[PDB]
Amino acid sequence: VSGKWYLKAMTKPDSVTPMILKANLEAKITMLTNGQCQNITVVLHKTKYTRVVFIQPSPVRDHYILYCEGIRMAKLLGRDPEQSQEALEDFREFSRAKGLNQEILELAQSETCSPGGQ
Ligand SMILES: [Ca+2]
């Protein structure tokens, strides 16, 4: 669960850069949001982690599913960028199976974020 990862879907972002999980666990995405850039860097510490976040394996080759409470959403991380309909279908069930049913948004993959006119 280390290295380049791709946040593929989620139950706001207009595009998203790759994810970098360093091992407490430490993630860095940068997120394109209405012509801005949100550079995130969230340490996850082991208590299910900490917001509160449960990482769980996906049933599918090369994918993981995140549940986090703190509003509650769900995310589908992948190890290679391409769309996996069968990874989605499972992320949907999981998402309804945990109380979340507000549009599986499948994310746009940019290699950089440049702010509007910045
Ligand atoms: Ca938008």
Spatial distance between the Cα atoms of 23 and 95, rounded to a whole number of angstroms: 27
Instruction: Compute, in angstroms, the gap from residue 10 CA to the centroid of ligand 1.
Output: 14
**Which protein residues have a CB closer than 5 Å to ligand 1 (ion)?**
14, 34
DSSP string of 54-96?
EEEE-SSTTEEEEEEE--EEEEEEESS-S--HHHHHHHHHHHH
Q: Which two tokens stand for residue 62?
A: 């090369």
Nearest to 18 by CA among 26, 3, 29: 29
State the residue for tokens 């049933």. Answer: 59
Give the method used: X-ray
Please give the Cα distance from 56 to 97 (Å, whole number).
14
Neighbours of 65 (CB within 10 A): 22
Backbone angles phi, psi at 94, to 5 degrees: -40, -45
Distance CA 81, CA 5 (A): 8
Closest CA to 14 of 27, 30, 2, 28: 30
CA of 48 to the centre of ligand 1 (A): 30
* Encoded tokens for 71: 């509003």
Rounded distance between C-alpha atoms, residue 53 and residue 50, angstroms: 6
3-106 domain in CATH 3.30.428.10?
no
The token pair that represents 117 in the structure block: 């006119």
Rounded to whole angstroms, how far apart are CA atoms 52 and 34?
A: 26
CA of residue 36 to ligand 1 center, whole Å: 10
44, 50 Cβ separation under 8 angstroms: yes
The CB density around residue 104, as the number of other CB atoms within 10 Å, is 17
Which structure tokens are listed for 29? 């995405």
Ligand 1 centre from 116 Cα, in Å? 12
Cα–chain center distance at 27: 10
